[PDB]
């Protein structure tokens, strides 16, 4: 199968990325994980997304996301991500093709304990995905929580 | 990595299951698609899910949907999903080891125009996974929509 036009200006994300992150909030201290994200399509105006963390040495699986990227020509995008931890999110946002990013903020966060708003940001810096999630809780304003780098499989 | 005491009651679902579905609602007549389900795990208290439909001779992509199930020992189970159309469900219900059934219903259907309720149902009928879906819109009662019969692969 071949690419559809909506998905072709984000065709660079396509494929398997692998690296490590460092999470860290005011409420918790520096912690580090490995990461694997996959980007794909069956040529609809949608990019499938699967992510997964694991503990570095062990590394027994931690967490896992799957979700779908639906981009539009106006540079608009909407992203729906499920959580193993039991979230769903409906992230609205945009993507710019010069810089090669995506940039979202949650619109609906569901089955959210104390989670107010999450804003994810996948930009290709220097050839590698640079995947940030910022977060707000019922007690802290939005700020950088995770941050992970990765390399093309 | 081991099937967690919480999950192992459901272990009869683990794996990849292929078959075909059939749609029909009062506004669309009967249809037919190929369909795969796969439940996996990673030794945590969650079964992962991923599903996809094609066109029977094409077999060209229709949709995908993927989430996470959260079984609890009590009986209660909460499901998560992000769907290809670009729609999230918080699924909520109750499984049943000996009837082999998982009856769920939506406590949050996010990013939906005209969709009001959804219920899923996975059961083992005589050897194979039946997958019955039922929907209600702005204009329709909760009536069935999709029905699939899959074969453990
Ligand atoms: Ba343009
Ligand atoms: Ba850049
Ligand atoms: Ba019991
Ligand atoms: Ba039965």
From Swiss-Prot, chains A, B:
Heme b binds at residues 27, 145. Its EC number is 5.99.-.-. Binds 1 heme b group per subunit, that coordinates a highly solvent-exposed Fe(III) atom. Its main location: cytoplasm. Pfam families: THAP4_heme-bd (PF08768). It catalyses: peroxynitrite = nitrate. InterPro entries: Calycin (IPR012674), Nitrobindin (IPR045165), THAP4-like_heme-bd (IPR014878). GO terms for molecular function: isomerase activity; metal ion binding. It is found in: Cytoplasm. Belongs to the nitrobindin family. Heme-binding protein able to scavenge peroxynitrite and to protect free L-tyrosine against peroxynitrite-mediated nitration, by acting as a peroxynitrite isomerase that converts peroxynitrite to nitrate. Therefore, this protein likely plays a role in peroxynitrite sensing and in the detoxification of reactive nitrogen and oxygen species (RNS and ROS, respectively). Is able to bind nitric oxide (NO) in vitro, but may act as a sensor of peroxynitrite levels in vivo. This is Peroxynitrite isomerase Rv2717c. It comes from Arabidopsis thaliana (Mouse-ear cress). The lineage of its organism: Eukaryota, Viridiplantae, Streptophyta, Embryophyta, Tracheophyta.
């Amino acid at each position: 199968p071949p690419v559809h036009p909506f998905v072709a200006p984000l065709s660079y994300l396509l494929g398997t990325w692998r690296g490590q992150g460092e999470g860290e909030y005011p409420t918790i201290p520096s912690f580090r994980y490995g990461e694997e994200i996959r980007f794909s399509h069956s040529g609809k105006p949608v990019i499938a997304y699967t992510q997964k963390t694991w503990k570095l040495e062990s590394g027994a699986p931690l967490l896992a996301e799957s979700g779908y990227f639906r981009p539009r020509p106006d540079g608009s995008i909407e992203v729906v991500i499920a959580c193993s931890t039991g979230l769903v999110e409906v992230q609205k946002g945009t993507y710019n093709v010069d810089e090669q990013s995506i940039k979202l903020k949650s619109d609906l966060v569901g089955n959210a304990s104390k989670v107010k708003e999450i804003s994810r940001e996948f930009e290709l810096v220097d050839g590698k995905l640079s995947y940030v999630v910022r977060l707000s809780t019922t007690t802290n304003p939005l700020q950088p929580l995770l941050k992970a780098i990765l390399d093309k499989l």
